[PDB]
């Protein structure tokens, strides 16, 4: 698909069997989801945004569907205002920015 | 162009007669530039993201050249860690996400 930007580029994702909404975000290095349970061990990570830095939980090699495209990769879990799909998984689904 | 997302999508902009580097950010509603002077009236605004909120100055009807494409719109100025081109100006240059 071709997604214009007049509205927030929100898509449905599936993770842990659960459907969620997330923002496709080219300004994010990493994928960040609201508090939820994921399998396996996690490692610490600090991420920075407009307001400063936060601590999140890094889970590696997580299966996630994005707008019907399969991805398997790192998901960060922490207090984000919105679920964000970042470049680490946008590259897996073949996304590009065009103008 | 077509911009792949293996790397941060950084482009050159011209604003207020100055060249700057900025991030093309589909997760951003608004455009936010590091502290600089702009002409005309402004009003205070708070904007938020990961890490919380910052106070910015809102300038309307500002022209910006983005990777050679001129656009006009609202620009926010404040202590952002990165210059961000948000959807309010990405729409004007016809930017889309494609996968």
């Amino acid at each position: 698909p071709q997604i214009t930007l007049w509205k927030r580029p929100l898509v449905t994702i599936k993770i842990g069997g659960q459907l969620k909404e997330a923002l496709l975000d080219t300004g994010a290095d990493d994928t960040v989801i609201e508090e939820m349970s994921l399998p396996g061990r996690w490692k610490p990570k600090m991420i920075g945004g407009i307001g400063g830095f936060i601590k999140v939980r890094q889970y590696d090699q997580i299966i996630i569907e994005i707008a019907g495209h399969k991805a398997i990769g790192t998901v960060l879990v922490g207090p984000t205002p919105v679920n964000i799909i970042g470049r680490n998984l946008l590259t897996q689904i073949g996304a590009t920015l065009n103008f | 162009p077509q911009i792949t997302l293996w790397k941060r999508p950084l482009v050159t902009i011209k604003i207020g007669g100055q060249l700057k580097e900025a991030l093309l950010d589909t997760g951003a509603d608004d455009t936010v530039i590091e502290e600089m002077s702009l002409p005309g009236r402004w009003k205070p605004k708070m904007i938020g993201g990961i890490g919380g909120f910052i106070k910015v100055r809102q300038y309307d009807q500002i022209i910006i050249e983005i990777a050679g494409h001129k656009a006009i719109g609202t620009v926010l100025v404040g202590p952002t860690p990165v210059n961000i081109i948000g959807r309010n100006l990405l729409t004007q240059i016809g930017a889309t996400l494609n996968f």
Binding site: - | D25, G27, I50
Partner: peptide, 5 residues
């Protein structure tokens, strides 16, 4: 809302 490094 603006949006991570």
């Amino acid at each position: 809302n603006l949006x991570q490094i």
